[PDB]
Amino acid sequence: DGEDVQALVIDNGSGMCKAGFAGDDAPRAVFPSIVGRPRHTGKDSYVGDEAQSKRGILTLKYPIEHGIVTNWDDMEKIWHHTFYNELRVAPEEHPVLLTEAPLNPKANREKMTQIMFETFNTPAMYVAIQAVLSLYASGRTTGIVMDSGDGVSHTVPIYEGYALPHAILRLDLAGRDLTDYMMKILTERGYSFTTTAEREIVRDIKEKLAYVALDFEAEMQTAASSSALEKSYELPDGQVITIGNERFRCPEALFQPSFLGMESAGIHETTYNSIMKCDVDIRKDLYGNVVLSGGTTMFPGIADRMNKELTALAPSTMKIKIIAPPERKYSVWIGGSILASLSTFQQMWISKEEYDESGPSIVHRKCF
Amino acid sequence: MGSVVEHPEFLKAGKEPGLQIWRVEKFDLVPVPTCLYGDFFTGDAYVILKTVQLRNGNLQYDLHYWLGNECSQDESGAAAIFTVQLDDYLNGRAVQHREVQGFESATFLGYFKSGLKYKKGGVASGF
Ligand SMILES: Nc1ncnc2c1ncn2[C@@H]1O[C@H](COP(=O)(O)OP(=O)(O)OP(=O)(O)O)[C@@H](O)[C@H]1O
Ligand SMILES: [Ca+2]
Ligand SMILES: [Ca+2]
Ligand SMILES: [Ca+2]
DSSP, X not given: OOSSSOOEEEEEOSSEEXXXXXXXXXXXXXXXXXXXXXXXXXXXXXXXXXHHHTGGGEEEEOSEETTEEOOHHHHHHHHHHIIIIIIOOOGGGSOEEEEEOTTOOHHHHHHHHHIIIIISOOSEEEEEEHHHHHHHHTTOSSEEEEEEOSSXXXXXXXXXXEEOGGGOEEESOOHHHHHHHHHHHHHHHTOOOOSHHHHHHHHHHHHHHOOOOSSHHHHHHHHHHOSTTOEXXXXXXXXXXXXXXXXXXXXXXXXOGGGXXXXXXXXXXXXXXXXXXXXXXXXXXXXXXXXXXXXXXXXXXXXXXXXXXHHHHSOTTSOOOEEOOTTGGGHHXXXXXXXXXXXXXXXXXXXXXXXXXXXXXXXXXXXX | OOOOOOOHHHHHTTSSSEEEEEEEETXXXXXXXXXXXXXXXXXXXXXXXXXXXXXXXOEEEEEXXXXXXXXXXXXXXXXXXXXXXXXXXXXXXXXEEEEETTOOOHHHHTTOTTOXXXXXXXXXXXX
């Protein structure tokens, strides 16, 4: 695709990679952040769906764990596939905007910059924090983003355009954990979901029929005395199963980590803790601008529950506003697209010329 | 080595006491003709800079980004970002404010002595 110089936007997640063209309203490509390599022989590699389909003869790996890159060779495969297979461009022809997790280690920010310029020869690049890009997509400069995906959840307070690092909280509880949990409780119901192929099925049950109850105990009750909340689901083979209270207990783990045997605070209290770490004078603006973002925030009912739980933690007079855009699965990507399209962005990129003068550490001065 | 906006409009911003208004137009910051100040297209997003003169010789800055009921996502996201960039350019001295159609702060409404007016329509989305 390409105004004058066409910029590209890559949003790399633990579970999914979202990639496209600056100026589009949505990612052109969305695929699993998976790299498959031969168990024995052909060097060779596979990415995404195709790696999954040949899993039986490949060793599969996730280069991003909890939002942080832990395998750079495999990350480079994701990137090479993104450019040549998914977007069909030559990277040396485009400025590339990439995204990162809050608190990304210094060394990792240097390495991304290094790979882009030295392995792909991008003429220009930029790295942006995911949460800040979602805040921008929602037309705000101050607010608190609750970002929950496949491997990690973060609560990121932002003021006048920048994250407040000291108040950011990380929660290793996200979509994967939820899928696994739905597997275990559907199993306990009498069904049996334990295999890789079954995991996939459950991920889909989770995405199609799960929901957050506004009142967990009242709902366990309704479910126990009625059959009204039940739903049927068709497995790939034609068999029909019945899902009941599992629909809402699964995402309840977001608000009650003890359900997963975890000792931490749930998303509502983590959001509250981040707000209380910020200057008392901006708290009103955080509470009134709680932006939900990421695939794990797509459960029906989650906004209403976040509203209820935050309203209970904060002084009754405090105005609470939960913003949960219908497109929040791609908010990070959309923010990146808007930012990279601005007439005033030209100046913000790290150019090849800057990179050749300072090396990878230029990233700590150019991208904050 | 630097990240300085060279957009002509940044050079004109906050030089003197007064009101400056720009409209987001297809990913760009574009001046509003001063005879049109106060007539806001509800299909658009805008950026307003109020510069007040201080005793000290320096200027006080209040940056407001106004969001119309029908503005597209690229427009509201760009107004917000342009606001951050203008504040930065001005050394972080602007105080930022989000203004939503129908819910504007009194200070913001107070800038338009003959009363702010809404009008339907506006420029097409940059997407
Ligand atoms: N409709 C849905 N309801 C509930 N969960 C969903 C829904 N749609 C997607 N998810 C989940 O969202 C997750 C992927 O979202 P996302 O792309 O935002 O994560 P990521 O970017 O890959 O992960 P992370 O941000 O932790 O690095 C998966 O766990 C997926 O199952
Ligand atoms: Ca993500
Ligand atoms: Ca418009
Ligand atoms: Ca400021």
